[PDB]
Design a protein around this ligand. Structure first.
Ligand SMILES: NC(=O)C1=CN([C@@H]2O[C@H](COP(=O)(O)OP(=O)(O)OC[C@H]3O[C@@H](n4cnc5c(N)ncnc54)[C@H](O)[C@@H]3O)[C@@H](O)[C@H]2O)C=CC1
Ligand SMILES: NC(=O)C1=CN([C@@H]2O[C@H](COP(=O)(O)OP(=O)(O)OC[C@H]3O[C@@H](n4cnc5c(N)ncnc54)[C@H](O)[C@@H]3O)[C@@H](O)[C@H]2O)C=CC1
Ligand SMILES: NC(=O)C1=CN([C@@H]2O[C@H](COP(=O)(O)OP(=O)(O)OC[C@H]3O[C@@H](n4cnc5c(N)ncnc54)[C@H](O)[C@@H]3O)[C@@H](O)[C@H]2O)C=CC1
Ligand SMILES: NC(=O)C1=CN([C@@H]2O[C@H](COP(=O)(O)OP(=O)(O)OC[C@H]3O[C@@H](n4cnc5c(N)ncnc54)[C@H](O)[C@@H]3O)[C@@H](O)[C@H]2O)C=CC1
Lengths: 329, 330, 330, 334
């Protein structure tokens, strides 16, 4: 019955969704192109559109989709800052998402970035691979005993905090809604500025909203402990990357791990190595020995993908039965 | 200025030891060469020799050292499988070590290898560096819920077990002397073969002895779960690397992280990139997308190095006060 | 509106062929799969099949193609060792090729491999990229004055010779046939074993036939000048790659540049980086600092591709008109 | 009755320097001291008491350095290099400090390297190597072009530029040339002299082989890049300051410049010849140049061949012996 058009489709998306669809028999169409004003016409006549985090679901796109017959927007993601939710509501277009496919996948990836940066595992790998077994510049630091500041102690942030507590770190936390689980781990809540000044490692797990946009700016970087590590597996626009470059150059910021980037939408998820990279700031970030960028793969585990696909297909079935689930606000 | 000769010296060694020697004023000499039968003559007239894990302290070397006037052997390491302890004892040469400079350094490195392999971070890095933001082949797996088998639950193995429990892993353990802290974490002890057959990830933290040599061989790899991950931050000779190659090629072994290698002694710690690598087995291990080798750097953190230098210099001061500590015995 | 089925099609092939002005109203179909016994059925009802150098055109494949209605085999290549020519002839299936799309493209690539190996440019690139501006191991040698031995002085060999003469190299040559252009360049013909013993650099440009198969074997490697450079942009089976590995490890062979490899057929032209590489010998060749392998891209220039497409489309038109051109004969 | 004292301090010394110079010194027995640091105002004191100082291309031999060296007893400055833009020759002369150099150790070593950069860029050999090393045997993005038939413009047809031109003519390239002082050997070769702007507009590949002087400084600037053929290749094995690298970045990003090979960089002096991989790179412009797939940078190694090194060492030790006997050779003058 039901027909679903997926934008920004990759092979991992079709594999996982085709496996999960043995339980549903929806008719699945995978389109590679990003959703934007000039591709929305591809969804003409599709009742359901399945979008990912760098699809453009601003007002003009939503208007096109609604006018073309689309009646549900299914986000195969937890995040939803790319959707104009007020406009969806005005158009009577429900928006559904997958709020907790695997908080562990994302938290673990953040911990992986930390360790790769700390022990210079990315540099080591390239050395041993060519028969360079020298260790200059690879000396790391013990995680045990360090102060780890978590900004945003929700599903992912809390899971990240628990892992880091298991390394014997001292947890510092900031959230407008503190939670008791963090305290039970030994964490202590404090104000943002104090967290920044006291943390050896900071990790961002708050959503992107008007209040978190450029939360990490020049001013705030200058507050941080010299040589600190910053991890961003949240959203690119949580940080001002031009300011990160200056702090990296001065040594003020010791390490940076990114799984997201502010201008990632038209570059991530494809191989653009054959052409010059246009984004000056990203190119410069990539040049540093103490920066690691992964291309928005913190979600990318077998279990995460299976849960995304199962929950998304269930969301759609629930909507089709008139009892929708996992709606976004 | 008591005189200490350091073999296999690297810049990080002379830097850390020099900083720590502000509190002692020993006279420190750093030799780059490895200690072996051929190089032992360099220690003539040195009362104290400081060696590392790839120096050869077998009987013939210890005999030369003793004949040349050396009276103490200070290991700037926790491990001591490179020392013939019976022969040291017969010669009246005490051997001292640093047993617990930082169990966390080594455990954390093992967990780093696990995550790099899992999320293919070493491959991702190289891709994004050149503007390849594609994700094919990089899908990993949640650590939460997996079974992690720890072989050797001592200072490092236990610290590793604790970290992995914090990711929500199910801990399985094998040690001739089980310890209660592991059970308090939720770990369950079992026999070696059962641990191998049931684990998704296996990590080696037992010392190298005649009983652990080639513990992971062809037969034991075949009993492991298909696609499992094996981590070796112990010693090279705990595994048979030729058998690892065959299991990697078949897919039987899904991942391998090594910080040690059986024939590392004359290879590691130096940049040999300008010449062909002679060792066929290491070259082949290095060829795989699901193998990561680090060059015996699990011990290499600021805190580990400072503790190694401080404890080693203190060990030597204690010896020279007639109250030796951190001795290793036959 | 004759239809053409292309096997082993890559994006650069379909772009190339579609952008030609020489379509002659043909209908072009591009299949990615390699031609072999179990894919030949895809050509059922196609009058013309276009194949590349790693397609299987042995007798059983040719029999299927003829039984399925294919009447012409068009090689988008110069080389034809992959074709059983006697069997094609017995089936009345003409085979056409492109013998001289661009001898310069291929010769220039060989020269590129030479310079890369000499100046260690592949190593330098990765160093500078990460801010390593050190030069240890990168010292090269002046080409000017060196002896360059060319095995096979045909279209590509003589173009290569000509380029190497322009660097002021001394040219040595071996071919069953004299070529007066080689003498005009200053080249001297000599016997194979003498060429091998006297040359600083050797480059292979003979076709693969039963007489050139494994021309470079253990015994002939041992005759070469110690530390010499060997370049192979001919065909993989001209050399014995297991013997190349031993000579590289001993230092007897100083450098190796390959654009071709004996078991390339099912490996080259794809990205196989996500899985272990099965071929031990290729994995080991890839491990060396003084080996460069490119994946059969010597033909791969803008001008070469355009000529291959134009000449191949013309060859097919000329066959259709009953005046065939560029036939290869048993 | 037959021959059977002299102390030399080398700045910016590397292992390949002490090895080559020690081999050549079997013929002399001078006393050789190798210092790693770069020569500049605050390291000049290390040459106190040394009659001879041997410097390389990134040592600072401006007036204030030369004044310290002279005051400290140094009597000869021996450049282990062909180039000399780093020396204030008028100041050396005013101080009575002769400066000697090695003008032609191996013009082939440098020309050949430039050709290597061309071919690596053209066939993407650097990209292919990293692919095949990890089992990626795909060829997308690696299509090159035939050199045969292309136009190659040589700016500066001296020893190196002429050797380069001859090599490129052997590939069947058409040679275009610009030099304020044309020479007949290039024409005899089939090369055609023309004005700079016309060379820039007509060339598929341009290679710089002029010295750095006040007239060649930023010779390749934004305006001259905009004159070039779209998608052209530029090669710089001359000096860093011959080009404006910020403008090269904009032309690379637009596609106006198709390829860039550098063996030299304007701010190289305090970074090249060292492994600086363990720290951030401070220079924004170099970091960005390094990011591109169609840029290759080698760290000033065009001179670096066995034969070049042996000639530099032999000629440099000979220049010092000749000076010591009062009959100096290979002097450079203001
Ligand atoms: N890189 C990746 O692949 C993925 C990234 N993400 C990002 O992670 C974010 C977090 O996801 P969850 O933890 O699941 O969400 P959640 O809703 O469980 O938790 C978010 C937390 O952030 C806090 N928060 C809100 N505003 C804040 C502010 N101004 N300052 C500090 N904290 C604030 C909330 O109070 C809440 O505790 C998502 O918004 C998404 O952008 C999510 C999934 C994958
Ligand atoms: N990669 C690196 O840089 C470093 C490696 N190591 C290695 O790790 C090893 C372990 O270190 P620690 O935890 O400090 O030692 P430990 O002595 O504290 O603990 C070792 C554990 O191994 C167990 N064990 C002994 N024999 C066994 C057997 N046959 N089978 C299974 N388990 C057995 C012991 O009962 C003990 O619980 C060292 O012996 C050394 O080789 C140590 C430091 C650094
Ligand atoms: N890497 C690549 O992409 C390419 C490789 N090739 C290979 O290069 C080969 C050469 O092609 P061309 O120069 O065009 O061919 P060609 O036919 O013009 O010249 C071949 C020469 O090799 C000589 N030769 C034949 N048998 C010989 C033997 N037994 N020993 C020594 N020399 C012998 C012939 O006398 C002739 O002079 C092709 O057969 C092909 O395999 C060709 C094009 C591209
Ligand atoms: N990358 C490297 O490792 C090396 C670089 N070089 C550089 O290459 C340069 C060339 O050296 P050689 O060819 O031996 O010098 P050379 O003196 O023989 O020739 C230089 C040529 O440039 C020409 N020229 C002078 N002023 C010019 C101007 N304003 N515009 C255009 N052309 C002009 C000259 O007339 C002469 O024909 C050296 O000055 C040096 O900076 C030299 C050696 C090694």
């Amino acid at each position: 019955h039901m027909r679903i058009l997926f934008f920004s489709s990759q092979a991992y998306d079709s594999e996982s969704f085709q496996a999960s669809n043995h339980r549903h028999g929806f008719e699945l169409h995978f389109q590679q192109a990003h959703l934007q004003a000039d591709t929305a016409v591809l969804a003409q006549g599709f009742e359901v559109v399945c979008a990912f985090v760098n699809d453009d679901l601003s007002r003009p796109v939503l208007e096109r989709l609604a006018a073309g017959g689309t009646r549900l927007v299914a986000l195969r993601s937890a995040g939803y800052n790319h959707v104009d939710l007020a406009a969806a509501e005005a158009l009577g277009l429900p928006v559904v998402h997958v709020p907790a496919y695997s908080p562990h996948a994302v938290a673990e990836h953040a911990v992986g970035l930390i360790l790769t940066l700390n022990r210079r595992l990315h540099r080591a790998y390239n050395r041993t691979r060519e028969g360079d077994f020298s260790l200059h510049g690879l000396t790391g630091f013990d995680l045990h005993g360090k102060r780890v500041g978590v900004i945003g102690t929700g599903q992912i942030g809390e899971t990240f905090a628990r892992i880091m507590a298991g390394f014997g770190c001292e947890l510092l936390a900031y959230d407008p809604y503190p939670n008791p689980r963090i305290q039970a781990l030994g964490g202590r809540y404090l104000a943002l500025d104090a967290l920044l000044a006291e943390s050896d490692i900071v990790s961002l797990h708050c959503p992107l909203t008007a209040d978190t946009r450029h939360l990490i700016d020049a001013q705030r970087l200058a507050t941080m402990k010299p040589g600190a590590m910053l991890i961003n597996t949240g959203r690119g626009a949580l940080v001002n990357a031009a300011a990160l470059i200056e702090a990296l150059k001065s040594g003020q910021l010791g390490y940076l791990g990114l799984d997201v980037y502010e201008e990632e939408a038209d570059i991530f998820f494809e191989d653009r190595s054959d052409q010059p990279l246009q984004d000056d700031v990203l190119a410069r970030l990539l040049s540093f020995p103490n920066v690691v960028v992964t291309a928005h793969q913190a979600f990318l585990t077998r279990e995460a993908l299976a849960a995304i696909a199962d929950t998304t297909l269930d969301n759609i079935a629930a909507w089709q039965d008139g009892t929708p689930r996992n709606r976004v606000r």
